[PDB]
From Swiss-Prot:
Residues the entry annotates as binding N-acetyl-beta-neuraminate: T311, D312, K327, R373
UniProt-reported outcome of changing K391A: Decreased binding of heavy chain to synaptosomes
Interval of the full protein contained in this chain: 863 to 1276 of 1276
Motif residue range(s): Host ganglioside-binding motif: 386-389
Name this protein carries in UniProt: Botulinum neurotoxin D heavy chain
Functional summary from the UniProt entry: Responsible for host epithelial cell transcytosis, host nerve cell targeting and translocation of light chain (LC) into eukaryotic host cell cytosol. Composed of 3 subdomains; the translocation domain (TD), and N-terminus and C-terminus of the receptor-binding domain (RBD). The RBD is responsible for the adherence of the toxin to the eukaryotic target cell surface.
Mutation effect (F376W): No effect on heavy chain binding to synaptosomes, whole toxin is slightly less neurotoxic
Ganglioside-binding loop: annotated span: 369-379
Outcome following mutation: Q261R: In strain: CB16
Domain notes: Has 3 functional domains; the translocation domain (TD) and the receptor-binding domain (RBD) which is further subdivided into N- and C-terminal domains (N-RBD and C-RBD, also called Hcn and Hcc). The N-terminus of the TD wraps an extended belt around the perimeter of the LC which occludes the catalytic pocket. The belt region may be a pseudosubstrate inhibitor which serves as an intramolecular chaperone for the LC prior to its translocation into the host cytosol.
Lineage, top ranks: Viruses, Duplodnaviria, Heunggongvirae, Uroviricota, Caudoviricetes
Effect on the protein of changing S396F: Decreased binding of heavy chain to synaptosomes
Region (C-terminus of receptor binding domain (C-RBD), Hcc): 222-410
Superkingdom of the organism of origin: Viruses
Length: 412
């Protein structure tokens, strides 16, 4: 079992147990967590570095210099205001004297550095920002993996994909720091913060296959994700967008839902917040899982409506290639016509597909239609279509849920 071989090689694993961050690898590293450091806010094993002063100090146990291969893996999510800074910040520091490793952020890039006793160093750089493209990873969870073969290469993977390699075999002795410090020493502002979760070190060089198993394991494949890669939750406001129309928000026009172009593509939090309600009554704010039944409530001009499927097809009972537009109802309640189900889809994720099984099996997608009974006007229209097997991989069927998140602040 690869996954057992993987886990057996862990020599540090920071995980939250009884509300403390501790090493659960079996090796008993000392973990000193700053009083103000927030733990377990999004993911069980996460921590927030939200300030200078916020620090976590790890002191590794007795098992001078690097003697063996190794890998380091964690997820990271870096706020917009931190990503947009042109400065450089050390985030994780494990250099003593002048040798060891460190992870830095600089101008929208993450950078891993390995430095020998003469201060010769090699770096791995990844531009996670892509100039703040709502297409990049600004404020989105992504999975980092560094692997080291001391008689070979140091490699940087992102979400299981190799991004850069550098020979390290030609460095002189790299002394190994028994201390690892998480935290930003620089003088950061209020909106500059980042989160890390599932930080692990392995005593071997993980293979790309091994890396993909860790990635798939820690992404939580049965948990639906919001736009940032956080778990999607009930009773939480989201701006829901279609993958094909990312600068359009959902809105009712004459009680037909359509997609309206953002007046300003740079502002994410635009439109009518939709709250997801559990059919089965779960604890408030509980995570939404793959396959859950859900009900969608829109806040529109300060009143709550339930989103429901149209009773009749769009060019109108129907069996063959039916297309239904959507609408709003002010009566909240468990109505089959307003029950949907939500499923994960997998490289490009953090998006979801939505289905309804009321009377006919449909999938929600967006395209151009004439959704008004008394008009031939076109509109980008979210619709529930039958016979959707050939559309199961169409981006028109992918939906994202943008939550107001602390790592992405928009002027008031
Ligand atoms: C004017 C308007 O909004 N008409 C809508 C009607 C009325 O909501 C319904 O007849 C009850 O009055 O329902 C639909 O036909 C439907 O659900 O199939 C869609 C149509 O867009």
């Amino acid at each position: 079992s690869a996954m057992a071989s993987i886990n057996d090689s862990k020599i540090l694993s920071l995980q939250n147990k009884k509300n403390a961050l501790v090493d659960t690898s079996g090796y008993n590293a000392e973990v000193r967590v700053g009083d103000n450091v927030q733990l377990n806010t999004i993911y069980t094993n996460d921590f927030k570095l939200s300030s200078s002063g916020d620090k976590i100090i790890v002191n590794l146990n007795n098992n001078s210099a690097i003697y063996e291969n190794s890998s380091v893996s964690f997820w990271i999510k870096i706020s917009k205001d931190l990503t947009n800074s042109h400065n450089e910040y050390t985030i994780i520091n494990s250099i003593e004297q002048n040798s060891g490793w460190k992870l830095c952020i600089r101008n929208g890039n993450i950078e891993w550095i390995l430095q020998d006793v003469n201060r010769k160093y090699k770096s791995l750089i990844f531009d996670y920002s892509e100039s703040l493209s709502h297409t990049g990873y600004t404020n989105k969870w992504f999975f980092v993996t560094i692997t080291n073969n001391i008689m070979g290469y140091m490699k940087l993977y992102i979400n299981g994909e190799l991004k850069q390699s550098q020979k390290i075999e030609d460095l002189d002795e790299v002394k190994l720091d028994k201390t690892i410090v998480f935290g930003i020493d620089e003088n950061i502002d209020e909106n500059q913060m980042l989160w890390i979760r599932d930080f692990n070190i392995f005593s071997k060089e993980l293979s790309n296959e091994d890396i993909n198993i860790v990635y798939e394991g820690q992404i939580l494949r049965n948990v639906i994700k919001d736009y940032w890669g956080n778990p999607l939750k009930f009773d939480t406001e989201y701006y829901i967008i279609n993958d094909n129309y990312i600068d359009r928000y959902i809105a009712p026009e004459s009680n037909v839902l359509v997609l309206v172009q953002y007046p300003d593509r740079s502002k994410l939090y635009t439109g009518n917040p939709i709250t997801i309600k559990s059919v089965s009554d779960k604890n408030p704010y509980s995570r939404i899982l793959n396959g859950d039944n859900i009900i969608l409530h829109m806040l529109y001009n300060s009143r709550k409506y339930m989103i429901i499927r149209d009773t009749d097809t769009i060019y109108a009972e129907c069996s063959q290639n039916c297309v239904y537009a959507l609408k709003l109802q002010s009566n909240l309640g468990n109505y089959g016509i307003g029950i949907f189900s939500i499923k994960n889809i997998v490289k490009n994720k953090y998006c979801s597909q939505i289905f309804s099984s009321f009377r006919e099996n449909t999938m929600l997608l967006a395209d151009i239609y004439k959704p008004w009974r008394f008009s031939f006007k076109n509109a980008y229209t979210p619709v529930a279509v039958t016979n959707y097997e050939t559309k199961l991989l169409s981006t028109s069927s992918f939906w994202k849920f943008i939550s107001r998140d602390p790592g992405w602040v928009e002027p008031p």
